[PDB]
Design an enzyme around this catalytic site. Structure first.
Site, PDB file in Angstrom:
ATOM      1  N   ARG A 113      -4.594   0.661   1.395  1.00  0.00           N
ATOM      2  CA  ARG A 113      -4.911   0.051   0.128  1.00  0.00           C
ATOM      3  C   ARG A 113      -3.699  -0.544  -0.573  1.00  0.00           C
ATOM      4  NH1 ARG A 113      -8.709   4.927  -1.594  1.00  0.00           N
ATOM      5  NH2 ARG A 113      -7.446   5.684   0.228  1.00  0.00           N
ATOM      6  N   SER A 114      -2.564   0.166  -0.542  1.00  0.00           N
ATOM      7  CA  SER A 114      -1.315  -0.250  -1.180  1.00  0.00           C
ATOM      8  C   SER A 114      -0.798  -1.547  -0.577  1.00  0.00           C
ATOM      9  CB  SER A 114      -0.227   0.862  -0.972  1.00  0.00           C
ATOM     10  OG  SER A 114      -0.484   2.006  -1.790  1.00  0.00           O
TER      11      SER A 114
END
EC number: 3.1.3.48
Length: 281
Positions: free
Chosen positions: A220-221
């Protein structure tokens, strides 16, 4: 341009292959510090480690190791710190880093527990009245304020270096609705969230780098930093259509391993840049 390469990949059903290729080309640098015996309990995952060359050093004598990486996008003129979700014993370290790097915003893309698996500790106070103090790092943290929206929550926090009695206001951007299975159907909300982060001042060169985490600080990051960077690139170069996502991803992976964790996150990343570009145009 890019919306077509998206289609070239689509009718081909090749998302997994492009994902495969990026993973085959990704760089590979040592992470000797991360793998030292003394740091075993400082990593959520034994296979997700910061490279030695871009790792964030805590400013203390005991042990400067935190699982966190400085992603420095030189052409885009933006840097990010990607980090794993803090562990029960690395919460002080996390806020220590935030303080030391002088970040204004912390970007959170996960829930503390997901599908029965702990992804990070409750590292911030859920109630104004029960402030947290991290004894090991000599920091105090207080929830000042919290604005809950449908798909995300923004909180105002006061971090106090209990040593200078200095205090800084930290903005916490929490994306609370990433789905249990797959990626969001539409990127709209992800982009709105990104925009809110940009709008807050958190990404300005005037501050230290935004700290972005998820469970490992790579899936996600990476999607967030990829999307943001690619938009900046588009704005900067004067031939916008020159921006190759696979290229910016590969360049990102020089600073931290495993950025973008599934083929579906790569497709979402392309989706987010196009629509973000469109919207901006």
């Amino acid at each position: 341009e890019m919306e077509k390469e998206f289609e070239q990949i689509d009718k081909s059903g090749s998302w997994a292959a492009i994902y495969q290729d990026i993973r085959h080309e990704a760089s590979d640098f040592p992470c000797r510090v991360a793998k030292l015996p003394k740091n075993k309990n400082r990593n959520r995952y034994r296979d997700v480690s910061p490279f030695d060359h871009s790792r964030i050093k805590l400013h203390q004598e005991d042990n400067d190791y935190i699982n966190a990486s400085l992603i420095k996008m030189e052409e885009a003129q933006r840097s990010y710190i990607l980090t794993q979700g803090p562990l029960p014993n690395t919460c002080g370290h996390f806020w220590e880093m935030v303080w030391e790097q002088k970040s204004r915003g912390v970007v959170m893309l996960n829930r503390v527990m997901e599908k029965g698996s702990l992804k990070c500790a409750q590292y911030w106070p859920q109630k104004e009245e029960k402030e947290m103090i991290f004894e090991d790092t000599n920091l105090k943290l207080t929830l000042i304020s919290e604005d809950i929206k449908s798909y995300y929550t923004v909180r105002q926090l006061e971090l106090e270096n209990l040593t200078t009695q200095e205090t800084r206001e930290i903005l916490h951007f929490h994306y609370t609705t990433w789905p249990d299975f797959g990626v969001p159907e539409s990127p709209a909300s992800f982009l709105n969230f990104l925009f809110k982060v940009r709008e807050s001042g958190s990404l300005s060169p005037e501050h230290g780098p935004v700290v972005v985490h998820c469970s490992a600080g790579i899936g996600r990051s990476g999607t967030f930093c990829l999307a943001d960077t690619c938009l900046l690139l588009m704005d900067k170069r004067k031939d916008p259509s020159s921006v190759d996502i696979k290229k910016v991803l590969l360049e990102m992976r020089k600073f931290r391993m495993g950025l973008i964790q599934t083929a579906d996150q790569l497709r979402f990343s392309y989706l987010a840049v196009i629509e973000g570009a469109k919207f901006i145009m």
